[PDB]
Design a protein around this ligand. Sequence first.
Ligand SMILES: Nc1ncnc2c1ncn2[C@@H]1O[C@H](COP(=O)(O)O)[C@@H](OP(=O)(O)O)[C@H]1O
Ligand SMILES: [Cl-]
Ligand SMILES: [Mg+2]
Ligand SMILES: [Mg+2]
Lengths: 547, 556
Amino acid sequence: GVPKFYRWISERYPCLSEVVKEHQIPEFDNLYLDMNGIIHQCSHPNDDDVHFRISDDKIFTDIFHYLEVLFRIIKPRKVFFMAVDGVAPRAKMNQQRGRRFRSAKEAEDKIKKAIEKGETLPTEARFDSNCITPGTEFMARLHEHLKYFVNMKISTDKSWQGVTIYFSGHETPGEGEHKIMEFIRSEKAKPDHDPNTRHCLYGLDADLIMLGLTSHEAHFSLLREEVRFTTFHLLHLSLMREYIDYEFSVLKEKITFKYDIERIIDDWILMGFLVGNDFIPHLPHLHINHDALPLLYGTYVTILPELGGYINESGHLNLPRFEKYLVKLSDFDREHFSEVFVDLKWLFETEFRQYKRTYYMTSDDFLADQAACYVQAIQWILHYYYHGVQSWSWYYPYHYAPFLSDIHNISTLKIHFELGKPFKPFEQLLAVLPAASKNLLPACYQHLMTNEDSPIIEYYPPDFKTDAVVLIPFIDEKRLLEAMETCNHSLKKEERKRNQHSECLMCWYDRDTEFIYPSPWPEKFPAIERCCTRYKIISLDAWRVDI
Amino acid sequence: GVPKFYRWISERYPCLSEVVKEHQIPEFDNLYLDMNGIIHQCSHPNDDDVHFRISDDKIFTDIFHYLEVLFRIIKPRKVFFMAVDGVAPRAKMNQQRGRRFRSAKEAEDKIKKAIEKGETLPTEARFDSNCITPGTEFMARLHEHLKYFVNMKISTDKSWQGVTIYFSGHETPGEGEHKIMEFIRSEKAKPDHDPNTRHCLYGLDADLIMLGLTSHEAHFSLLREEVRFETTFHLLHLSLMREYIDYEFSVLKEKITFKYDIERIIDDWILMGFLVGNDFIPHLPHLHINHDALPLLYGTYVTILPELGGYINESGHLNLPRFEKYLVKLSDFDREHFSEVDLFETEFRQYKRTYYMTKMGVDVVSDDFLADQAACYVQAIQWILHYYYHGVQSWSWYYPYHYAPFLSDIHNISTLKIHFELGKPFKPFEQLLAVLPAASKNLLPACYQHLMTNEDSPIIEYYPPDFKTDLNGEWEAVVLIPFIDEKRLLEAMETCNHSLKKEERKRNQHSECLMCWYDRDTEFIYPSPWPEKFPAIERCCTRYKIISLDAWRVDI
Ligand SMILES: Nc1ncnc2c1ncn2[C@@H]1O[C@H](COP(=O)(O)O)[C@@H](OP(=O)(O)O)[C@H]1O
Ligand SMILES: [Cl-]
Ligand SMILES: [Mg+2]
Ligand SMILES: [Mg+2]
């Protein structure tokens, strides 16, 4: 099984995506691995099975196997970068909240079902997959196991001894993807960067593909096992860049500025964002997804000549250009409306606008503001990909995108972001967790989620509608923080310790190093007698570039 | 521009369809040309100008020019097959009527508007495009000229020498494209047929794409000039399309119980294509060509294929159990569309009931009526598949409603018995009477005209001077005029057939495809079909064979 964006790409460009056995995998210099997928798979693979239980020792053992096998098979010759999600920008936090609410509700529903058929549950509580959020006790124990694992491998396995290993764990702010991109940019910025560096990124997900392309690195490949643990899906972005080039070649006869594959790829990326539902979803009945891309490509080819240049200029949205592209693309909405208007017969404008109005209600200045926020959202996402986070606090305050036909008068819109700063882990926990998960928090905060008189009780509804789109309130930053103030100094010692940001590690084997690395859990794993790891700690701001 | 379905596949498969200059057109063995679009283009290019007039010799000159240019540029090495539409199966009768009725209505509206502005029109009659129908005086004249043109070319132009020319004109029954397909099948039947034959089919229309694929020929391409007549051309290689589809569906390779076979997948792909509507069957409600509809069909196909014991379209024979399963799944489309606009089931039924009463003017929308709708639909799908794969299997069958059923009503069809009788093509005057409005009656022999005008004519109800047109839309107009019962038409006609004039009797018949070639030992005077306007061929070098009507028909 493969993700939708992957397959669609595959099908659009035959000859492109490959399936290859172990021995036919090429040589690679750098391997990037976002761990969150692995942690989920190793901790809760059988969510259908209300009876399934797994102990931490088994989780960690399993996480270890994944790293060992992936490393053994990809054999990165220069760099291995392991990332675990740290605290995310607010813009990502609404989606994180959604998933966590959905997840708790779905597991409680399944439990209730099992009970209704008179089944008897295990007595020990379930693994609450919502514990896979930066700053929880589970993530802290995991973090210690991963560090240990790296030290162990460095100290025992020759194949881990000639490589620079980076570990960016849950205390280092940013989603693992964003962290990987940040490291890729700093590498590109180093004066001797070899443009033929061979990168391998583990995964097939839409955001990974976009990440690999946004890098603009010549040789970038995504990889994943075919059968879920041997053959592997292998996607070469160098070929994909070539397929894209050939597809867009016709513009060489049409545009009066330089056709540049790198610039075309940037606009291709922007169009992929316009149809993505993985950030701001479109209304389900508009069928705006991957299948709409050919229409967006079509419209791009047609209009690019009148534009005078590209739309996504290395992450900077050209607003006049963008407005014209949208205006043209906006026909799509009436095409869809017309299927509905037909049924009504058994003036179009009055009917189309009252079609739109009816959806919005699920004011005139509401349109413009929603329009403006949407454009801001696009710029925010573009920044995230090309430049890194430009606002930790900004978010898109609606559950759905506006109708494209409603995005206009945006060409001189003023888009100013404040960088702000990441939440402390516990602020993050309260901003992403449902009351059903309250046990993941320190005691001193738990009542904010449960108690009828809590000042922010409305952010933790036990029941809510779902369309996935989870219909729950948007947290007001000031109210969340204000409410926590009164509780913060009731935090235990180990808890104040978890409530901190912490740095990325750079690690490598050294012939001239020996010390004792203590087991994170003595009963399950040995201490490292003779640990040969040399480390450099990377300062938090080290790879951040200012616009 | 290009047709919608072409545009669609161009967008779905982006490295499929090039625009090429003349000098880059590959070599072709066989060129197939259906002529009707050309004839319409040369006879009435400017319908918004109510003043435009054009003499027949001019129309013929321009047709000759179009043909000469396409032949020069494509230069088929082995075969050129030119077809004009002959009488069509009655399956097409409603749509042929629809176009001709609207054409006369639209012409009259333009004239009325010109006169409202105080314009004065030429006193000579405009060209009635309804005359482009088998067996008219205009089509018989044109036919004479096209035979003359073939002979002239063969006799004078070396690139027309050493190639076999076929001309299947308006007196040979069948739509041009399907006479072309019959030819292609007769070629494949031969022991020495070369699988590497390079075929070129002129045009970009959806039926042409489908026929190309239905041929299962390895190298078949479509071509049409980018701008109508340094010139550029759309070129679609079906070899490439086949590969693309092979990929789109290879995911199935592991999921299925039975042998994965690209040929069988193409069959099913072509079947799905029929669901968006054609000349023969109205489209399913809410299912038009665009981005979502089609992948939905194809996505559903991906999803459900594993569950079946095999393919749905088995070489042109519909597998009814499998087709049902498929439609049933696809129907989820209907509820989603409706949920936009168990209480639900009740409201949906009343939604659907309204459509059936309002659009098909039926009285009682019962389960039995719904089962009847389902039966008509599936028999239509099977008629079309026969038509593409085996050749027409009933000359009389037709779809009897102007609108299709809801996809959600098409069920309970698994064990349906589908029976067709071959019958035979109408004589051209029988089609001509059927398909024309009273405003074009002067194209018919005088002896039949009262049938379409007289208040006591037994078939007067078929020729309403006024009618409604559903004009929603891109989209195709639905013309709401009655379906002809051929038994009543033919009985009314027998009151008049024996009154035909001698020249008219000569046009009311079927006649054969011609096969023509340069022969060095041949020399004779070929007469001008119009002495005052075109010269005799003093040294005609054409040798020829008349191909009997049944020569390429296969009993199923
Ligand atoms: N009014 C018109 N203008 C242009 N072409 C027309 C036309 N009516 C018919 N045609 C052409 O002639 C073909 C045969 O039409 P008919 O069957 O009514 O005689 C049509 O193919 P399609 O039926 O595939 O559109 C189309 O190519
Ligand atoms: Cl002869
Ligand atoms: Mg035809
Ligand atoms: Mg047809």
